[PDB]
Structures are given as C-alpha cells and as structure tokens.
C-alpha cells in the first residue's frame, strides 16, 4: 500500500461565511479579522486603516484613560498633599 497524503493545516487567510448560522460567532468578530492580517499580512485583504481605532472608538479610549489613569503631575501633587497631611 501507499499511505494517504500527510495531513496538513489549511493555508492562507480564512474568512468564514457570515450568513451561515452554524459558523461560530467568535470567528466573525473584528478581533478575528485583525488576526488574519497579523498571520498573513497583505494577502489577508484587510484594509490596514481598519486595524487602528475608529474616531468614535478613539474617543472612548481617551475618555477611559482620563478617568482611571491620571497624569504624572496629578499623581505627584496628590502624594505631596498626603505627606503634608501626615506631617
């Protein structure tokens, strides 16, 4: 006998069918799309501008940053006041 051809992983970018109900949800997110570009680069067909945050998304990131991540000067000033209160 001759053995069957060796099993191989499917090559190239893979875009699942959106309409098909069976197709798993996780494969249709933008997160999945970006992963195709990372592995296969240009041949993925992803428009690179999509990889970066969109202007509405950019505002959300900046809004989140201000609330929870203060600037160095504010951090220093608050620490200074606490020492004075302790002193």
């Amino acid at each position: 006998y001759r053995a069957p051809p060796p099993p191989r992983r499917r090559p190239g970018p893979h875009s699942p069918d959106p309409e098909n109900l069976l197709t798993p949800r996780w494969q249709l997110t933008p997160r999945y799309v970006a992963k195709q570009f990372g592995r296969h680069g240009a041949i993925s067909g992803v428009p690179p501008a999509s990889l970066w945050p969109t202007p509405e998304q950019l505002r959300e990131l900046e809004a989140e940053e201000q609330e929870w991540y203060p600037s160095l000067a504010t951090m220093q000033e608050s620490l200074r006041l606490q020492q004075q209160a302790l002193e």
Binding site: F37, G38, P70, M75
Partner: protein
C-alpha cells in the same frame, strides 16, 4: 558500545517481543479472592463500611479545629500583591558566561526571557524582575540592564564594573507583550502605550537613588558617586567608554520596545511595519 553488539546476536525486535521496564507497573487488586474479598477491606458494618462517613474536617460534632481558630488577615489582598521574579548576579553571570545573554546590547526583560534566564508569569501577578545582590562579589561583567526593582548592593556591583542599571515600570498588559512580543504581533493590533506607575510606585521610580526611569537625570551623578564612596570603589567615567552609546540607551517611559513607537503595526508576514497617519491617533499615541 558492546550492548549494540548484543542486539546483533539476538532475535528481531518486534511487537511480539515487547516488555515494560521492570517494576514500572503495579498490580491492580480486585475484591474477588478471600484475601481482598469478603468484607473487601472496609471493615465491619458501620457508617464507614457503608461509605457514608462525614466530610473531611468533621470531628464528630465538636467544633472543628479549622473553625475554632480566629480569622486573621494572613492572605488578605494576596491576589492583588505584586510579585517580582528574583534574578541574582550569580545567575546573571552564569547566563552571560554561557552566551545566553548578549552583553554587547542592552538587556531588558525580553532578552532575559528569550535566553530562558528568567521565567515570567504575568497571569500569576508577576510585575517583572528584581536584581538580587547574591553573587555580587564575583560579578565581573560590564552590562546595560533594565529591571523593575534593584537593591543597593546589586546596583553597586553593576556600576563598579562600568555598567548601567535602571529601574522601569511595566503594567500587566505591557508586561505580557514585553515577555512574549511575537504572539502579540500575530494579533494584528498596533503597539499600545505604556501606562505610568500607580501612585504607590511613583516615589520609587522617580528617585535617583533607585535609578528610576522617571527620576531626574541631573541627580544621577551625585547618587552614583555616593555608592562609590560607601562601598569603597572608584566610579568609572563611562562617557569615555567606547560602548557609551549602547550603555546610555534608555527607553521612553511610554515605549515597550527600543525601536518601536506606540501605535505601529508589525506586519511579520511581509516584513513591514505600518505607521498611522491620522493626526488624532498620533496625538493619542504620542501622548
């Protein structure tokens, strides 16, 4: 190898001649014969013999030992404490001697991880590597190394030999990318910014004596000389050193990699790096 000559004499190895290594398999005992049958090892009839004895820690109705002891905050906040993998100078010298860490280029957590010198677990609350004084007496290498924490004795050994040490802060998201850059690149996202230390750690990383990456450079010469006088060595003028450009190299407080700015996309497949041109994004990343 005379053992291979023995194989020549013996019959063919095959599926019919196979044998496990001696004593590799214990015998499984079934309750069928008189020895292990009958009561089957469970004893006389009772709660234990019927399989319904009380749970572990139950003491027959008196207040159990694990409940009578007062509650005390030994492990309070344990999951939120930061852990630092300790790297000793003895281990650092061993890695440098065997070629696993390249002293010509600057040393960061990525190089230590790539050479397997240190094992980092961000999921288990690691915030990086601390320099440990052990092995200081026998450390004889000139190195540029970036660590998250350092001790006075460890810093003394690095500086005495002519090297540079700085303490830098990486956040949990940044630490994972730094430890394993390539898996991050395959995701296809742009490189994120590095968050500044929490308010608790701001004093540490803004202090010259700790060689903080946010500390004032103007105060470094005084701090460096003070160690020299305290520990009885002569401070070496590293500017004259030929490798001064490498030794002086330091990352920007918001940069994860030496030559990659925040917001770039690493296209490993095509050997390219893509940079955003939108002004609003550039303000976001440049900040």
């Amino acid at each position: 190898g005379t053992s291979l000559d023995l194989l020549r004499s013996l019959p063919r190895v095959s599926l019919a001649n196979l044998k496990p290594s001696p004593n590799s398999r214990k015998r499984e005992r079934r309750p069928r014969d008189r020895r292990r049958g009958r009561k089957c090892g469970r004893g006389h009839k009772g709660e234990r013999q019927r399989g319904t004895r009380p749970r572990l820690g139950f003491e027959g109705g008196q207040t159990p030992f694990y409940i009578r002891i007062p509650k005390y905050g030994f492990n309070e906040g344990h999951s939120f404490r930061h852990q630092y993998q300790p790297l000793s100078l003895r281990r650092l010298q061993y890695l440098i001697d065997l070629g696993r860490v390249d002293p010509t280029q600057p040393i960061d957590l990525t190089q230590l991880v790539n050479g397997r010198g240190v094992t980092i677990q961000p999921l288990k609350r690691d915030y990086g590597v601390q320099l440990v004084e052990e092995g200081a007496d026998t450390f004889q290498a000139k190195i540029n190394i970036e660590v998250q924490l350092a001790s006075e004795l460890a810093i003394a050994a690095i500086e005495k030999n002519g090297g540079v040490v700085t303490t830098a802060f990486y956040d949990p998201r940044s630490l994972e990318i730094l430890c394993k850059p390539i898996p991050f690149f395959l995701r296809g996202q742009p490189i994120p910014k590095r968050m500044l230390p929490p308010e608790s750690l701001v004093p540490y990383y803004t202090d010259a004596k700790n060689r903080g990456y946010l500390a004032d450079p103007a105060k470094f010469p005084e701090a460096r000389l003070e160690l020299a006088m305290k520990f009885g060595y002569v401070l070496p003028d590293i500017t004259k050193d030929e490798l001064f450009r490498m030794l002086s190299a330091r990352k920007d407080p918001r940069q994860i990699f030496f030559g990659l700015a925040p917001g770039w996309v690493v296209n490993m497949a095509d050997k390219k790096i893509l940079k955003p041109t939108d002004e609003n994004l550039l303000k976001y990343y440049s900040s």
